[PDB]
Amino acid sequence: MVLRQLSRKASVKVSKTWSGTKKRAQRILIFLLEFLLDFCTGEDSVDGKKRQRHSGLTEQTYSALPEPKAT
């Protein structure tokens, strides 16, 4: 209705339409280039988070379905 958080769709489809294209894109080009270099070297996302997004101890929801939670 009124609230239109672009962030909620940016988390799904992202859509870099105008979101950083006028000026940010000039370096996205370089980022694209160097990506090939760094990816060949190793990982660029040094995040040692285990599990998916939860360890699932008391999480006994045996749904196993693509349930639309919030994201």
Could you tell me the end-to-end alpha-carbon distance of the chain, in angstroms, rounded to an integer?
19
| Residue 42, domain extent | 1-71
Give 2-45 as a 3 state SS string: CCCCHHHHHCCCCCCCCCCCCCCHHHHHHHHHHHHHHHHHCCCC
- Method used for this model? NMR
Number of domains in the chain: 1
Give the whole-angstrom CA distance, residue 44 versus residue 42: 7
Q: How far is CA 67 from the centre of its chain?
A: 19
